[PDB]
């Protein structure tokens, strides 16, 4: 029951996955003359396949360790979305079918979109059955009334809007145009950025809307808008796949002398970061999270294999992208003894962990809720008169109430509990995109971070002689409309 | 099956409805200490049990006109949201049973709030079943790369956003506040406002947001941050449910002396149109949309009861909470009583224009299905011309028929559908006023919106019919 390529395995308790192994779904208008048949995802996403090994390689590691959670098996069924509403919610109906022969999933590990992660909570609500998330960072997903079982291991979008006013402020600049995308996470981000610069007398010049399927028309408007004004700095607040037709028609048109200041979504993107537009992208200044540390991940991630790997169904198509070669059930045929390390795709081509940390989080914290169900006495207990719930026959509200209520270390040495409204607070890394002497590559280095924990006015530390401001200059651009 | 109160038929084509008949859902802690329980709903609408008879009569109007749709028999499912996202999907997850002993639904008939609507959309785009709203109203709905199968009897927000930047041109005003409801009917609104009222080298000064279930710190904090400003106008794109708390506090306060600018969901809201709130939202100018004419409605409407009515479940209800009895199965009920001499929204009306839009819907889908009917071999708008077969009709082929509707209702205007599946209407502006005989509020017309007219000769106002604050007959100052 559900879609057909999925990684499955049996254990006493299934858990639940969302990763978006494609980067959408092809654009060919529906004439219904026929009966409508199922769509086909076009782009393959390879850095939302090393998130999937990492939900993998946690619960395995569970599953050997005797001090968490003994004598239990874990299982899984992850489904893929393509970051498509619908896709997602047939693997949702999917997940609630019995919940209402096919076992229960108690917890699902959420989706990345906040458009997705909504319409997933939405259904998923009505069960209460608790939903981790490791990338929506939209605050219209910290309202209780409408969302009551969702959680997330990722800060929300307010501080990164302050801190851009903030950087804004501090580098002395009074004119600005904005860019948001059209979805649940661009909206607010922007319209809370425009709030905080009226509040430190900032003057925004214009304000546009963009999208992944903009037709022609549109494009040109948002180009013809840009390139008629005197600002120089622009603010954006959307995605890689969503900014991606804008930046070609930039490039293309050779528009340069632009500052952009870049969210987390796509100041590290692949789809944007590109040797080509260097001279229209070059020099942007964006955010990042805090990076973890696995000590076993790139071991596991090496030793994938099409015939190995059974309970994994994305490994064939893996290995098909990577290799340009088609398996025998005109590309060659693949050999099976093909090294990926000879590829250069983003499966393995990293620097930090921070995506995979958070689904590395959001494991440990189901497993700990559960070691907490199960390693409790009576007379203790969070329910009515103290007591304790079985362990075998688990329900997934209880679960959510013990994640409710979570506080354990993890292999850091830090703590991790969650908020009233199931929301983590975390440190902002500043970056700054460069050209790489050797490769040619675009490398994006470290100049600053913004503090959190400080007081107002406290928490922004920027170091100046780091920052290329267009790859190859040292001197502040003037972005004033008028001369003093 | 699915919630237990319904109304429903049994025939050979079913429909579906999803009609607010209570406001809300209590307000209940849940400490999960035991197992969850369905959360039970609150205040009654009577203005939404109208909206369900009106599908209903005609429905029952259809099954009665031979030249519609003969030797066919048309029934329906209809449910109660409570104005609630969980409540809708509950209901829904109803609808589309078979197509993942279950009659298979055809089509149905939207709900009221956008928020609702969008969250049922995204679930009946997935099996291609065709769905007509008659209320909302969100720019955000017109995305066919989202809302595969999603229709309007009803106008965007984007001509009544240029309409209130109009109308504050008009009367020379360049300083005023906004604030809007946080969902998916207020933000959108209120943005693209703002974006109109810059062009116009009009000045903002504040712009705050509301809910329902706002706590008393955030409702303090809207409140003084009105009293500190000199901007008179103020601009609302909220419901009355949304709005409420707001004016009840600012009343406790006795604040006076603003304009307020309506926006058609709470414009004839009785919610807030309260004779104890005269003195604070008197003087309102707001928007409604154009009336139709439903021969034969009222003699439908005043024949309800709940012992005759066996196909409808919210009958009792309604009955217990006109009469305010207790039925036998608080006085108990006789059962004789008259609906006329209690005075409620149901029957107490001056125009139907949101009622006007269910009985649109229901002949757009029947003239579909009539279309269906008489296709004649070769002129098929299928493969190779070919026709559908009205024996086995699918929901796929309702919706590329109402894709490419074109017929006439009742007046004698015609009624289709654009690209996007939405539509085009006139809009009407009123006041509010003060009965002198019984003290009610009073909706007067002082004017409308032409949206076939060129752009800058669309608005059209009568000052001379406009009273200020409800006493004054001067233009009021705003300019800082
Ligand atoms: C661009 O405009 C900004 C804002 O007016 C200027 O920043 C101000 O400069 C004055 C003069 O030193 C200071 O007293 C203010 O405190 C500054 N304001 C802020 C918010 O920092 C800036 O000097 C202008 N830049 C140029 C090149 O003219
Ligand atoms: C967020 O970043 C700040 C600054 O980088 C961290 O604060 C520092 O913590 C170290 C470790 O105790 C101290 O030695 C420094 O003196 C601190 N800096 C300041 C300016 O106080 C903070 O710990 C980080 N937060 C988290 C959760 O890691
Ligand atoms: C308030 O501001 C409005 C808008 O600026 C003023 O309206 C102007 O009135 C003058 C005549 O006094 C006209 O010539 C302008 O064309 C009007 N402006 C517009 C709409 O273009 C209004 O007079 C101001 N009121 C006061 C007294 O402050
Ligand atoms: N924070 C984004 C999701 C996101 C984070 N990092 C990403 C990297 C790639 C794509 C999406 C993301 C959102 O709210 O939607
Ligand atoms: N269109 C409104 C709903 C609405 C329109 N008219 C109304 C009258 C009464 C109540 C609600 C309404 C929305 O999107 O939410
Ligand atoms: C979690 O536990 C630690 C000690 O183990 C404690 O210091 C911390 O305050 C706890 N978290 C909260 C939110 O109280
Ligand atoms: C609809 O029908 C009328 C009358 O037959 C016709 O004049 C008109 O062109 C048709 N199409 C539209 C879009 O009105
Ligand atoms: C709208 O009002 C104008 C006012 O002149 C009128 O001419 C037009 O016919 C009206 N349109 C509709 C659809 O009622
Ligand atoms: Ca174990
Ligand atoms: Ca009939």
């Not at chain 1, 995109?433 to 922004?460: C, M, T």
């Not at chain 2, 070919?386 to 009742?410: G, P, Y």
């Not at chain 2, 289709?416 to 009073?442: A, K, M, Q, R």
Request: charged share 20%.
């Amino acid at each position: 029951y559900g879609p057909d390529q999925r990684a499955q395995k049996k254990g006493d308790i299934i858990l639940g996955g969302l990763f978006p192994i494609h980067f959408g779904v092809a654009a060919k208008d529906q004439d219904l003359k026929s009966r409508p048949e199922s769509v086909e995802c076009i782009r393959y996403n390879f850095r939302g396949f090393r998130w999937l090994q990492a939900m993998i390689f946690a619960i395995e590691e569970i599953n050997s360790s005797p001090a968490l959670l003994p004598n239990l098996t874990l299982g899984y069924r992850i489904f893929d979305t393509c970051n498509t509403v619908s896709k997602a919610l047939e693997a949702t109906l999917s997940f609630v079918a019995q919940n209402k022969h096919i076992p229960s999933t108690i917890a699902v590990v959420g989706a990345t979109g906040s458009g997705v992660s909504t319409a997933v909570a939405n259904l998923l609500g009505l069960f209460y059955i608790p939903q981790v998330s490791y990338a929506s960072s939209s605050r219209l997903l910290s309202n209780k009334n409408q969302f009551k079982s969702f959680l997330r291991t990722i800060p929300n979008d307010e501080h990164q809007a302050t801190a851009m006013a903030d950087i804004i402020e501090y580098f002395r600049w009074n004119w600005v145009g904005t860019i948001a995308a059209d979805d649940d996470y661009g909206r607010p981000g922007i319209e809370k950025f425009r709030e905080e610069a009226e509040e430190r007398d900032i003057c925004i010049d214009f304000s546009e809307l963009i999208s992944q399927y903009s037709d022609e028309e549109e494009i040109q408007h948002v180009v013809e808008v840009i390139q008629n004004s005197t600002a120089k700095v622009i603010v954006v607040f959307s995605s890689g796949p969503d900014l991606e037709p804008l930046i070609k028609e930039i490039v293309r048109r050779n528009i340069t002398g632009k500052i952009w200041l870049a969210s987390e979504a796509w100041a590290s993107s692949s789809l944007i970061a590109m040797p080509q537009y260097f001279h229209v992208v070059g020099g942007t200044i964006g955010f990042a999270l805090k990076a973890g540390q696995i000590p076993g991940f790139r071991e596991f991630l090496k030793k994938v294999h099409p015939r190995k790997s059974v309970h994994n169904g994305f490994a064939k198509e893996f290995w098909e992208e990577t290799f340009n070669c088609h398996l025998q059930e005109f590309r060659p045929l693949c050999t099976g003894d093909e090294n990926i390390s000879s590829v250069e795709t983003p499966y393995i081509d990293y620097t930090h962990l921070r995506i995979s940390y958070n689904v590395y989080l959001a494991v440990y914290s189901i497993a700990h809720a559960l070691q907490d169900i199960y390693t409790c006495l009576p007379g203790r207990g969070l329910f009515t008169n103290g007591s304790c719930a079985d362990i075998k026959k688990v329900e997934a509200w209880q679960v959510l109430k013990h994640l409710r209520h979570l506080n354990f270390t993890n292999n850091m040495g830090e703590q991790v509990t969650f908020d009233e409204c199931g929301d983590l607070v975390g440190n902002y890394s500043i970056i700054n995109w460069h050209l790489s002497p050797e490769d040619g590559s675009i490398v994006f280095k470290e100049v600053g971070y913004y503090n959190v924990y400080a007081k107002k006015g406290e928490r922004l530390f920027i170091n100046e002689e780091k920052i290329l401001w267009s790859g190859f200059s040292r001197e502040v651009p003037f972005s004033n409309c008028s001369r003093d | 099956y699915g919630p237990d109160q319904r109304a429903q038929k049994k025939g050979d084509i079913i429909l579906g409805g999803l009609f607010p008949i209570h406001f809300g859902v209590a307000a209940k802690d849940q400490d999960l200490k035991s197992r969850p329980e369905s959360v039970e709903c609150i205040r009654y609408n009577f203005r939404g049990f109208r909206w369900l008879q009106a599908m209903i009569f005609a429905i029952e109007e259809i099954n009665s006109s031979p030249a519609l749709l003969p030797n066919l028999t048309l029934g329906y499912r209809i449910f109660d949201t409570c104005n609630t996202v969980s409540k809708a999907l509950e209901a829904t997850l109803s609808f589309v049973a078979q197509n993942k002993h279950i009659p298979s639904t055809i089509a149905v008939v939207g709900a009221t709030g956008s928020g609702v609507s969008t969250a049922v959309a995204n679930l009946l785009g997935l099996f291609y079943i065709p769905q007509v709203s008659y209320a909302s109203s969100s720019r955000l709905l017109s995305n066919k790369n989202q809302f595969k199968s999603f229709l309007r009897t009803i106008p965007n927000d984007e001509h009544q956003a240029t309409a209130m930047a109009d109308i504050i041109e008009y009367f020379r005003w360049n300083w005023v506040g906004t604030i809007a409801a946080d969902d998916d009917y207020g933000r959108p609104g209120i943005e693209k406002f703002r974006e109109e009222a810059e062009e116009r080298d009009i000045c903002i000064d504040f712009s705050e947001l509301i809910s329902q279930y706002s706590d008393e710190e955030e409702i303090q904090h809207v409140v003084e941050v009105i009293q500190n400003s000199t901007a008179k106008v103020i601009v609302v794109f909220s419901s009355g449910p949304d709005l409420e708390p707001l004016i009840k506090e600012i009343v406790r306060r006795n604040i006076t002396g603003k304009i307020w600018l309506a926006s058609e969901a709470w414009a004839s809201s009785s919610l807030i149109a309260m004779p104890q709130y005269f003195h604070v939202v008197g003087g309102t100018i707001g928007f409604a949309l154009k009336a139709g004419q439903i021969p034969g409605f009222r003699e439908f409407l005043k024949k309800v009861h709940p012992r005759k009515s066996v196909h409808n479940g919210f009958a009792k209800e309604f009955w217990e909470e006109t009469f305010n009895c207790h039925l036998q199965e608080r006085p108990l009920c006789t059962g004789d009583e008259n609906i006329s001499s209690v005075e409620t929204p149901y029957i107490d009306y001056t125009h139907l224009r949101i009622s006007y839009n269910v009985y649109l819907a229901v002949y757009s889908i029947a003239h579909a299905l009539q279309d269906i009917y008489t296709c004649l071999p070769g002129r098929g708008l299928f493969t190779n011309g070919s026709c559908a077969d009205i024996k086995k009709v699918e929901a796929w082929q309702v919706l590329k028929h109402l894709r490419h509707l074109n017929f006439t209702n009742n007046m004698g205007e015609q009624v289709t559908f654009d690209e996007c599946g939405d539509l085009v209407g006139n809009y009407s502006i009123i006041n509010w006023h003060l009965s002198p005989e019984d003290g009610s509020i009073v909706f007067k017309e002082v004017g409308y919106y032409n949206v076939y007219a060129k752009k800058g000769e669309r608005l059209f106002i009568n000052e001379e019919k406009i009273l200020w604050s409800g006493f004054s007959r001067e233009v009021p100052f705003s300019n800082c």
